[PDB]
Amino acid sequence: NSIQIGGLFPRGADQEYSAFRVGMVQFSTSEFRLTPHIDNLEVANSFAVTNAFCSQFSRGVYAIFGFYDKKSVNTITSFCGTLHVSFITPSFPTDGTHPFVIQMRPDLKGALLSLIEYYQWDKFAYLYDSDRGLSTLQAVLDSAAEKKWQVTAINVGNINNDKKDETYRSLFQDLELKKERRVILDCERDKVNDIVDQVITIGKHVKGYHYIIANLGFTDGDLLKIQFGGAEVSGFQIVDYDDSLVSKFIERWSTLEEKEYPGAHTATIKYTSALTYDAVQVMTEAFRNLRKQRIEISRRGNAGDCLANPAVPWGQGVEIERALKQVQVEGLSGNIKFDQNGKRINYTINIMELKTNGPRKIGYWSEVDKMVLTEDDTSGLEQKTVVVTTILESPYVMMKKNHEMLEGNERYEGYCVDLAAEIAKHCGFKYKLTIVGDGKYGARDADTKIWNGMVGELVYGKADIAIAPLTITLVREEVIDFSKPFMSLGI
Amino acid sequence: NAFCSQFSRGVYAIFGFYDKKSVNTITSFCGTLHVSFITPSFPTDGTHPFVIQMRPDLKGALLSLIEYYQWDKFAYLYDSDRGLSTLQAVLDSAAEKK
Amino acid sequence: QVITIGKHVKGYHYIIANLGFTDGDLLKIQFGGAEVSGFQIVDYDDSLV
Numbered sequence: 204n205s206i207q208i209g210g211l212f213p214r215g216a217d218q219e220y221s222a223f224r225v226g227m228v229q230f231s232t233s234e235f236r237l238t239p240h241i242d243n244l245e246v247a248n249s250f251a252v253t254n255a256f257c258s259q260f261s262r263g264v265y266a267i268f269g270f271y272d273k274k275s276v277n278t279i280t281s282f283c284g285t286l287h288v289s290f291i292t293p294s295f296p297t298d299g300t301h302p303f304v305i306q307m308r309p310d311l312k313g314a315l316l317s318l319i320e321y322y323q324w325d326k327f328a329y330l331y332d333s334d335r336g337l338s339t340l341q342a343v344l345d346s347a348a349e350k351k352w353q354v355t356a357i358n359v360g361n362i363n364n365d366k367k368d369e370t371y372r373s374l375f376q377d378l379e380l381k382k383e384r385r386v387i388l389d390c391e392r393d394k395v396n397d398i399v400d401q402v403i404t405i406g407k408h409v410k411g412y413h414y415i416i417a418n419l420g421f422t423d424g425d426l427l428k429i430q431f432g433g434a435e436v437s438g439f440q441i442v443d444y445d446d447s448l449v450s451k452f453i454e455r456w457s458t459l460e461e462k463e464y465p466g467a468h469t470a471t472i473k474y475t476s477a478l479t480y481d482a483v484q485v486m487t488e489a490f491r492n493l494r495k496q497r498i499e500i501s502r503r504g505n506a507g508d509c510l511a512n513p514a515v516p517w518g519q520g521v522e523i524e525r526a527l528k529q530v531q532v533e534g535l536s537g538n539i540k541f542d543q544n545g546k547r548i549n550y551t552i553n554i555m556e557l558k559t560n561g562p563r564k565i566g567y568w569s570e571v572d573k574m575v576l577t578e579d580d581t582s583g584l585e586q587k588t589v590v591v592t593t594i595l596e597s598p599y600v601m602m603k604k605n606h607e608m609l610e611g612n613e614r615y616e617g618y619c620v621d622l623a624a625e626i627a628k629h630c631g632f633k634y635k636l637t638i639v640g641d642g643k644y645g646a647r648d649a650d651t652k653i654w655n656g657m658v659g660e661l662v663y664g665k666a667d668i669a670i671a672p673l674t675i676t677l678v679r680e681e682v683i684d685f686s687k688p689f690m691s692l693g694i
Numbered sequence: 695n696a697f698c699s700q701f702s703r704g705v706y707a708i709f710g711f712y713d714k715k716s717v718n719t720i721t722s723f724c725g726t727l728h729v730s731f732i733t734p735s736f737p738t739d740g741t742h743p744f745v746i747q748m749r750p751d752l753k754g755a756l757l758s759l760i761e762y763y764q765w766d767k768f769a770y771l772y773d774s775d776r777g778l779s780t781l782q783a784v785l786d787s788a789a790e791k792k
Numbered sequence: 793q794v795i796t797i798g799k800h801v802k803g804y805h806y807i808i809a810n811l812g813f814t815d816g817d818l819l820k821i822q823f824g825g826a827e828v829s830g831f832q833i834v835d836y837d838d839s840l841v
């Protein structure tokens with residue numbers, strides 16, 4: 204059953220079309236085959252989108268797969284909601300709940316709100332690009348108003364190429380006026396690779412700055428530039444290279460010839476191509492389940508003008524979309540589920556931070572569950588809160604009256620408490636205030652030399668330091684050491 | 695449907711309104727078919743040919759009025775259906791005039 | 793390698809000990825913030841030059 208479909212592809216989406224050609228024969232042919240008529244045409248001109256859509260409807264196909272631009276989303280929704288033709292896409296998700304659209308890209312916005320709330324920012328800059336749309340820009344301003352944030356949002360996308368070396372210099376020097384430190388980028392990969400190079404030229408990647416990339420292929424762009432900088436760069440991934448089928452596709456993908464499939468003989472892959480691959484899995488699961496339920500899709504006639512007045516559609520496409528919304532397989536993004544509208548739920552997004560060795564994950568974020576860090580505590584050097592022993596003596600070390608409600612190093616008060624804070628301020632270490640157990644100053648035992656008290660805590664390696672009323676004698680210098688004396692007294 | 699029907703009718707000059715969702719469809723037909731279109735609707739953003747528009751721009755006057763009232767901190771309630779060009783405009787002057 | 797590891801901000805200061813100071817690349821650290829001085833024996837302003 205070679206079933207007629209239609210495909211829309213931009214002039215330059217060569218990696219994506221090659222991944223579609225791979226996924227075409229990656230799994231098929233125990234059954235029905237596909238008849239893809241490919242349209243390597245533009246996406247900006249909605250008249251061209253109209254011509255291609257009426258051409259493929261003149262063909263009379265059952266389903267159309269491809270991309271759309273923000274100047275075409277209204278046209279695609281307006282034709283598909285009329286003519287009941289199910290349309291599937293990997294592009295940016297739509298704003299309104301529209302029928303007959305399945306969209307392969309998950310949400311980013313709740314993830315990005317989770318990331319900002321995890322880092323606990325208050326004031327930042329937001330460089331956005333207009334031509335991807337403004338839904339995230341609308342979403343962050345509401346929570347910025349509620350969560351008392353201070354956003355300086357800046358449009359950057361309409362800047363031409365021929366002034367594109369000094370516009371960024373004026374832009375970041377205006378950011379130097381408020382002395383910005385925290386930048387969220389929201390662009391395509393080309394604008395990211397343009398803006399990272401201009402940052403690394405004007406010298407803004409030292410320790411102190413902090414960058415969040417709002418894309419899905421965090422490692423799909425260049426990261427060898429600002430890897431060794433000093434700035435810290437975080438982003439998101441939906442394609443995790445650790446997994447079994449992922450690494451299988453990596454080995455399958457690397458061994459292909461570049462000449463037959465352009466952009467294929469690399470290690471990594473674009474997330475757009477990954478979703479294009481999973482789209483074939485969904486689309487074949489559809490016609491699989493319709494032969495499971497044995498429902499015939501016989502058109503039984505020709506199609507005609509797309510301008511038919513009034514045009515009348517066929518509701519077996521409604522049943523096609525109904526069976527599309529029930530597809531649940533595993534793919535490169537993980538599990539998939541759909542809503543009542545065609546939007547994706549049941550996804551998982553990995554949080555990816557850049558380190559010196561390279562990228563690494565620190566946690567995941569689900570469709571309902573918030574940010575769960577994976578407890579990756581590779582911090583090998585923790586400055587230990589050192590052991591400070593003392594004893595209760597007025598006014599050297601005294602209890603407070605409200606010690607149960609307070610905690611720890613706040614509970615004690617006196618001369619020695621004030622002194623130890625000065626020592627730790629001058630020396631930069633961490634400390635915890637402890638008490639000697641046996642309640643003594645300490646002397647040695649007869650015939651066994653067992654120093655008890657505050658002496659043996661330092662002799663026997665128990666306590667680390669002792670700021671306390673201790674008297675320099677002759678018999679104490681042999682086992683512990685003393686500084687210069689700080690307060691004189693007598694019997 | 696209406697535009698294809700009237701160009702099949704052989705219209706010499708097209709006039710009518712548009713919302714935020716059909717603006718690309720009409721400018722994409724008119725740039726190809728070279729038909730003069732006239733409108734009282736909201737003005738566009740990019741310089742498109744064959745579109746005459748009677749509604750004047752606003753953003754310069756509104757920025758001048760904010761500078762005259764001498765403000766620093768305010769709220770801004772918007773609707774999306776007329777477009778978001780003014781919202782994109784006032785944020786840049788917010789970035790400049792702090 | 794300096795411009796990769798990020799040592800050309802305002803504060804650092806470099807002296808090139810050569811004769812063709814402009815014969816090498818200077819578009820890299822021109823906009824940095826560091827200050828770079830050197831020597832020339834071939835002056836492009838002159839007539840025969």
Ligand SMILES: NS(=O)(=O)c1cc2c(cc1Cl)N[C@H]([C@H]1C[C@H]3C=C[C@@H]1C3)NS2(=O)=O
Pocket residue numbers: 687688689690691692
């Ligand atoms: N007047 S006092 O007892 O509180 C007192 C006693 C002393 C102080 C400082 C004070 Cl405020 N520092 C001295 C040190 C300073 C120098 C000279 C000896 C030691 C080094 N030791 S000390 O003689 O023990």
